[PDB]
Design an enzyme around this catalytic site. Structure first.
Site, PDB file in Angstrom:
ATOM      1  N   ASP A 189       8.513  -4.712   1.727  1.00  0.00           N
ATOM      2  CA  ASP A 189      10.208  -5.070   1.602  1.00  0.00           C
ATOM      3  C   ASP A 189      10.907  -5.357   2.956  1.00  0.00           C
ATOM      4  OD1 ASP A 189       9.582  -2.765   2.571  1.00  0.00           O
ATOM      5  OD2 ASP A 189      10.284  -1.453   0.772  1.00  0.00           O
ATOM      6  N   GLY A 222      11.538  -0.729   7.201  1.00  0.00           N
ATOM      7  CA  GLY A 222      12.059   0.261   6.272  1.00  0.00           C
ATOM      8  C   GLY A 222      11.350   0.387   4.910  1.00  0.00           C
ATOM      9  N   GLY A 225     -13.821  -5.437  -4.937  1.00  0.00           N
ATOM     10  CA  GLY A 225     -12.620  -6.401  -4.528  1.00  0.00           C
ATOM     11  C   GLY A 225     -11.448  -5.831  -3.573  1.00  0.00           C
ATOM     12  N   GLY A 237      -9.985  -3.417  -4.530  1.00  0.00           N
ATOM     13  CA  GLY A 237     -10.074  -1.707  -4.332  1.00  0.00           C
ATOM     14  C   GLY A 237     -10.334  -1.338  -3.131  1.00  0.00           C
ATOM     15  N   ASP A 276      -8.800  -1.401  -0.345  1.00  0.00           N
ATOM     16  CA  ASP A 276      -8.045  -2.026   0.735  1.00  0.00           C
ATOM     17  C   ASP A 276      -6.801  -1.290   1.153  1.00  0.00           C
ATOM     18  OD1 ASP A 276     -10.142  -3.532   0.368  1.00  0.00           O
ATOM     19  OD2 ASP A 276      -9.188  -5.579   0.050  1.00  0.00           O
ATOM     20  N   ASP A 330       2.554  -2.902   6.472  1.00  0.00           N
ATOM     21  CA  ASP A 330       3.919  -3.554   6.221  1.00  0.00           C
ATOM     22  C   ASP A 330       4.123  -3.968   7.863  1.00  0.00           C
ATOM     23  OD1 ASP A 330       6.339  -5.082   6.129  1.00  0.00           O
ATOM     24  OD2 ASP A 330       7.265  -3.495   4.790  1.00  0.00           O
ATOM     25  N   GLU A 331       3.863  -5.280   8.007  1.00  0.00           N
ATOM     26  CA  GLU A 331       4.001  -6.017   9.278  1.00  0.00           C
ATOM     27  C   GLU A 331       5.413  -5.744   9.912  1.00  0.00           C
ATOM     28  OE1 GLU A 331       1.671  -7.333  11.814  1.00  0.00           O
ATOM     29  OE2 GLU A 331       3.369  -6.272  12.626  1.00  0.00           O
ATOM     30  N   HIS A 359      -3.094   8.150   6.071  1.00  0.00           N
ATOM     31  CA  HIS A 359      -2.499   8.282   4.897  1.00  0.00           C
ATOM     32  C   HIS A 359      -3.059   7.391   3.610  1.00  0.00           C
ATOM     33  CE1 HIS A 359       0.625   9.788   1.982  1.00  0.00           C
ATOM     34  NE2 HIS A 359       0.554   8.373   1.640  1.00  0.00           N
ATOM     35  N   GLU A 360      -3.137   6.024   4.182  1.00  0.00           N
ATOM     36  CA  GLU A 360      -3.521   4.946   3.205  1.00  0.00           C
ATOM     37  C   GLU A 360      -4.928   5.292   2.874  1.00  0.00           C
ATOM     38  OE1 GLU A 360      -1.610   3.400   1.782  1.00  0.00           O
ATOM     39  OE2 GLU A 360       0.024   4.164   2.481  1.00  0.00           O
ATOM     40  N   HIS A 373      -5.519   7.446  -0.029  1.00  0.00           N
ATOM     41  CA  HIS A 373      -5.315   6.691  -1.194  1.00  0.00           C
ATOM     42  C   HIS A 373      -6.688   5.642  -1.058  1.00  0.00           C
ATOM     43  CE1 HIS A 373      -1.556   8.322  -1.769  1.00  0.00           C
ATOM     44  NE2 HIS A 373      -0.798   7.479  -1.071  1.00  0.00           N
ATOM     45  N   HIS A 398      -1.099  12.245  -4.077  1.00  0.00           N
ATOM     46  CA  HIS A 398      -0.122  12.820  -3.234  1.00  0.00           C
ATOM     47  C   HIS A 398      -0.320  14.326  -3.192  1.00  0.00           C
ATOM     48  CE1 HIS A 398       1.642   9.553  -1.348  1.00  0.00           C
ATOM     49  NE2 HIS A 398       2.275   8.973  -2.355  1.00  0.00           N
TER      50      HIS A 398
HETATM   51  C1  LIG Z   1       2.508   6.682  -7.926  1.00  0.00           C
HETATM   52  C2  LIG Z   1       3.661   7.639  -8.200  1.00  0.00           C
HETATM   53  O1  LIG Z   1       3.781   8.869  -8.509  1.00  0.00           O
HETATM   54  N1  LIG Z   1       4.985   7.129  -7.762  1.00  0.00           N
HETATM   55  C3  LIG Z   1       5.487   5.705  -7.734  1.00  0.00           C
HETATM   56  C4  LIG Z   1       4.866   4.866  -8.992  1.00  0.00           C
HETATM   57  O2  LIG Z   1       4.914   5.268 -10.048  1.00  0.00           O
HETATM   58  C5  LIG Z   1       3.957   5.096 -11.040  1.00  0.00           C
HETATM   59  C6  LIG Z   1       2.350   5.590 -10.763  1.00  0.00           C
HETATM   60  O3  LIG Z   1       3.988   4.240 -12.122  1.00  0.00           O
HETATM   61  C7  LIG Z   1       5.504   3.605  -8.795  1.00  0.00           C
HETATM   62  O4  LIG Z   1       5.151   2.734 -10.067  1.00  0.00           O
HETATM   63  C8  LIG Z   1       4.226   1.741  -9.942  1.00  0.00           C
HETATM   64  C9  LIG Z   1       2.726   1.633  -9.981  1.00  0.00           C
HETATM   65  O5  LIG Z   1       5.104   0.452  -9.798  1.00  0.00           O
HETATM   66  C10 LIG Z   1       5.111   2.912  -7.599  1.00  0.00           C
HETATM   67  C11 LIG Z   1       5.531   1.422  -7.363  1.00  0.00           C
HETATM   68  O6  LIG Z   1       6.635   1.163  -6.547  1.00  0.00           O
HETATM   69  C12 LIG Z   1       6.783   0.777  -5.451  1.00  0.00           C
HETATM   70  C13 LIG Z   1       7.765  -0.305  -5.210  1.00  0.00           C
HETATM   71  O7  LIG Z   1       5.904   1.193  -4.816  1.00  0.00           O
HETATM   72  O8  LIG Z   1       5.396   3.733  -6.329  1.00  0.00           O
HETATM   73  C14 LIG Z   1       5.272   5.170  -6.337  1.00  0.00           C
HETATM   74  N2  LIG Z   1       6.441   5.608  -5.355  1.00  0.00           N
HETATM   75  C15 LIG Z   1       5.707   6.154  -4.403  1.00  0.00           C
HETATM   76  S1  LIG Z   1       4.464   7.069  -4.534  1.00  0.00           S
HETATM   77  N3  LIG Z   1       6.264   5.943  -3.306  1.00  0.00           N
HETATM   78  C16 LIG Z   1       6.035   5.148  -2.018  1.00  0.00           C
HETATM   79  C17 LIG Z   1       4.932   5.461  -1.146  1.00  0.00           C
HETATM   80  N4  LIG Z   1       4.500   4.764  -0.125  1.00  0.00           N
HETATM   81  C18 LIG Z   1       3.102   4.179  -0.229  1.00  0.00           C
HETATM   82  C19 LIG Z   1       2.150   5.212  -0.122  1.00  0.00           C
HETATM   83  O9  LIG Z   1       2.243   6.260  -0.612  1.00  0.00           O
HETATM   84  O10 LIG Z   1       1.005   5.135   0.468  1.00  0.00           O
HETATM   85  C20 LIG Z   1       2.853   3.489  -1.802  1.00  0.00           C
HETATM   86  C21 LIG Z   1       3.801   2.419  -1.821  1.00  0.00           C
HETATM   87  C22 LIG Z   1       1.492   3.153  -2.128  1.00  0.00           C
HETATM   88  S2  LIG Z   1       5.148   4.629   1.115  1.00  0.00           S
HETATM   89  O11 LIG Z   1       5.053   3.379   1.328  1.00  0.00           O
HETATM   90  O12 LIG Z   1       6.490   4.847   0.816  1.00  0.00           O
HETATM   91  C23 LIG Z   1       4.574   5.426   2.121  1.00  0.00           C
HETATM   92  C24 LIG Z   1       3.494   4.859   3.282  1.00  0.00           C
HETATM   93  C25 LIG Z   1       3.114   5.784   3.921  1.00  0.00           C
HETATM   94  C26 LIG Z   1       3.542   7.215   3.907  1.00  0.00           C
HETATM   95  C27 LIG Z   1       3.070   8.209   5.019  1.00  0.00           C
HETATM   96  C28 LIG Z   1       2.851   9.476   4.580  1.00  0.00           C
HETATM   97  C29 LIG Z   1       2.646  10.428   5.393  1.00  0.00           C
HETATM   98  C30 LIG Z   1       1.786  10.233   6.677  1.00  0.00           C
HETATM   99  C31 LIG Z   1       1.874   8.831   6.967  1.00  0.00           C
HETATM  100  C32 LIG Z   1       2.530   7.809   5.848  1.00  0.00           C
HETATM  101  C33 LIG Z   1       4.303   7.745   2.811  1.00  0.00           C
HETATM  102  C34 LIG Z   1       5.158   6.705   2.152  1.00  0.00           C
HETATM  103 CA   LIG Z   2       8.756  -2.081   4.755  1.00  0.00          CA
HETATM  104 CA   LIG Z   3       5.663  -5.350  13.264  1.00  0.00          CA
HETATM  105 CA   LIG Z   4     -12.157  -3.678  -1.014  1.00  0.00          CA
HETATM  106 ZN   LIG Z   5       1.076   7.815  -0.296  1.00  0.00          ZN
END
Ligand SMILES: CC(=O)N[C@@H]1[C@@H](OC(C)=O)[C@H](OC(C)=O)[C@@H](COC(C)=O)O[C@H]1NC(=S)N/C=C/N([C@@H](C(=O)O)C(C)C)S(=O)(=O)c1ccc(-c2ccccc2)cc1
Ligand SMILES: [Ca+2]
Ligand SMILES: [Ca+2]
Ligand SMILES: [Ca+2]
Ligand SMILES: [Zn+2]
Ligand SMILES: [Zn+2]
Length: 158
Positions: A70, A73, A85, A87, A89, A93-94, A113-114, A117, A123
């Site tokens: 996105d 931010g 596959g 899985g 990975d 976000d560049e 963190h990633e 997952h 979480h």
């Molecule tokens: C999963 C859940 O419980 N929450 C929702 C989903 O709802 C479901 C399951 O349907 C929602 O639903 C779906 C599958 O569409 C899902 C999709 O929405 C979008 C656009 O992402 O989002 C979840 N909301 C969450 S958990 N927030 C996003 C989090 N980040 C990621 C992550 O946690 O890794 C995540 C995208 C994989 S983050 O980019 O904001 C992020 C990246 C990095 C740290 C970080 C932290 C600490 C240290 C360093 C780094 C934090 C946060």
């Molecule tokens: Ca971003």
């Molecule tokens: Ca960059």
């Molecule tokens: Ca893989």
């Molecule tokens: Zn996360």
């Protein structure tokens, strides 16, 4: 969720961010994997050819996985759960500014963190946990997995 059903797991950097130099990227990722093998019998090996369990990608916007980034931010990165596959990975976000320390989004913490997952972690509700959903820059000198991080990962892998 499914966990990797093997303790020897390979990873590969598909492409490099221009924000940091390569050695800083390599270092952050490698260190990032070490955080998790330090408290588990998992063992990580970087390969430079063939196909890896965990593929580290830098990408902007839409990048072919049906989960577009996105711009700067909001969403920093996401990673797919253990699996064949796509899985496991981990994509970054560049359009964030990736850094060795602060003044950006720290690559090391974000990859710790990633990777979590990528190993099938959820979480945490502890704001001191690396798997806490909100990103905030913390002191890498005093960086440490929280109890919650340790309990969760060792419930999947011992
Ligand atoms: C999963 C859940 O419980 N929450 C929702 C989903 O709802 C479901 C399951 O349907 C929602 O639903 C779906 C599958 O569409 C899902 C999709 O929405 C979008 C656009 O992402 O989002 C979840 N909301 C969450 S958990 N927030 C996003 C989090 N980040 C990621 C992550 O946690 O890794 C995540 C995208 C994989 S983050 O980019 O904001 C992020 C990246 C990095 C740290 C970080 C932290 C600490 C240290 C360093 C780094 C934090 C946060
Ligand atoms: Ca971003
Ligand atoms: Ca960059
Ligand atoms: Ca893989
Ligand atoms: Zn996360
Ligand atoms: Zn992606």
């Amino acid at each position: 969720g499914p966990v990797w059903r093997k303790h020897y797991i390979t990873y590969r950097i598909n492409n490099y961010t221009p924000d940091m130099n390569r050695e800083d990227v390599d270092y952050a990722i490698r260190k990032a994997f070490q955080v998790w093998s330090n408290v588990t019998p998992l063992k990580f090996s970087k390969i430079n050819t063939g196909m890896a369990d965990i593929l580290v990608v830098f990408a902007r916007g839409a990048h072919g996985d049906d989960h577009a980034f996105d711009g700067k931010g909001g969403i920093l990165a996401h990673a797919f759960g253990p699996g064949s596959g796509i899985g496991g990975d981990a994509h970054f976000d560049e359009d964030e500014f990736w850094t060795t320390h602060s003044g950006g989004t720290n690559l090391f913490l974000t990859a710790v963190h990633e990777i979590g997952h990528s190993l099938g972690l959820g979480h945490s509700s502890d704001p001191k946990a690396v798997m806490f959903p909100t990103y905030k820059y913390v002191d890498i000198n005093t960086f440490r997995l929280s109890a919650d991080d340790i309990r969760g990962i060792q419930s999947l892998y011992g």
